[model samples]
Target: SYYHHHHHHLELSDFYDPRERDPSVSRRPQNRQSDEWIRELLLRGTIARVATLWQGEDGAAFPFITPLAYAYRPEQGDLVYSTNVVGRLRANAGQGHPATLEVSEIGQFLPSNSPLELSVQYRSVMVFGTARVLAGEDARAALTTLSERVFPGLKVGETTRPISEDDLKRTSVYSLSIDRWSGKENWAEQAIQEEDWPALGPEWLG
Candidate 1:
């Protein structure tokens, strides 16, 4: 069948581990010193995906993901985001499940004579950390902070009304504390190596 024949080229090795990559020294630079740069990426991201895990009564496991608008709060040293109180994200994360947040941008495709060597340009940050549902004054405070970030000068109770008890009951506010993070970027305006195929033109550079 067409589906089986074409898709057979795809790899689905779930147990694959990068640590055992068993390859040459990585060309990917490790960002150990750019905390501010990483924060900037988080701020630029309008949408982020939170990845979590779920288990069934039969002991089978599943990976779950939720997407939401988020804001970076350096003051609290965590990420602030929200969804409905009854959502799967709220239910799973509130149980103290481990989660990872990822934000990224896709750029131009890099071409090469060899089809297998073709690559895409991108910048992404993956934060592996623990998530918790906020409550009481902390929950309200996070919502307030997120509002200001989303809409500058939109002060709570001034430009906007203060958070009411009913509001708190209906919304789920979460904060993801950064345990460790990795940022990788590949945005070369020009080709790093001359290819047998045509290189990226100047028109694409600007």
Candidate 2:
């Protein structure tokens, strides 16, 4: 998707159904909605995890997943993330392999009363896309965008460093040209019994 401009809504269509038993696929809530779970957590948080396919032309085919602290760009069709100019992520992405990233938060831990219901409620989103290093002004802008994302406390100009030609050379600014992105969450997965679903009580308190 080339980034829906009208609404920044995180609506999801690629989700799994819990009723079906398929280990290879994931189960989505009945709503199957995506509403900024990752953005809030990742933008509010300082880190994320990235997975990339690493294959060799003549060597063994392999896939590697590495955790990284990335900066997000909602307005762009791609995500802005960077690493040291030379590193594993930098190396793999340079070779033109697609990547996946997952970021999540353990909302309120819902403790089931019994052992049979030891389940957790949470929110998470995964982005699938192709990545490449940014160049020229785009790279510079990404670096600037990252500044506000990670260091919110610092004022706009106060947070970012002045970019120079040399500094750009030393840094790696990569963007994930998102193919399709989605947010998966335990939004309405709570199987509250029929008795508890509408047990009216004090509107404000127990």
Candidate 3:
């Protein structure tokens, strides 16, 4: 589930195709992914869920996935998403449970006339890593970065909105150190031979 190149770890094997497979577009059996394709998909995704698994430092295992507005820093291969106050995620990290998060986006929709032929084009990325809180100036930076990432035209240097001193106090800033990551695409992969995909008729029409 792990592949490393110059200390960069990627978990491409975790990327699975739950639909049909095509030899022409599908990857060779569990082959190493091309870095260019993986990075391109990762950079394009904006919303991702920060999934967490928790227990005491020594015992227990509980898993939960939560949707979050995340900002990814490609250079560090880290994800920046914040939370408010102390929630389950904060509690789990406080108790010492490692966390994982995922980001996904579809390139386009590919429609077919038949149920068996139904499919879409998609690309996704997942990151598994340790989670913790950021504080002080780090927290401030995280919020600033998140704001800028979410609102493209917003000026990071402008004091127009005027962030209050307590903004950091009320919010949680945690960065996920991606211990491993995964990426995938399903568009051209599931395209089967037209003969195998029976054409639909009026009976199947809704």
- Candidate 3 lDDT, 56-134, residue by residue in tens: 4556655667787878777766778887523333335353346788767665554455556566666676677887777
Report the C-alpha lDDT of model 1 over 40-157, residue by residue, as the tens digit: 8888777888886666555555666778888877777789888762333332525565779998888988755455656787888888888788897989999888888878778999
Q: Please report how far candidate 2 places residue 50 from its true position, in Å.
A: 0.9
| Ranking, TM-score, top scorer first | 1, 3, 2
Global lDDT of model 1: 0.74
Residue 46 deviation, candidate 1, in Å? 2.8
- How high is the CA lDDT of each candidate model? 0.74, 0.64, 0.66
Runs in model 2 lying further than 4 Å from the true structure: 1-31, 35-46, 56-58, 85-95, 153-160, 187-206
lDDT of candidate 2 over 1-206, digit per residue (tens): 44885456764322564454668544556524444545665566556677765455545455666666677676787677777523333335345558787777665544443445445676677889888878888888887777666776754455555777787898888887777767766743443323434543444122
Better of 2 and 3 by lDDT: 3
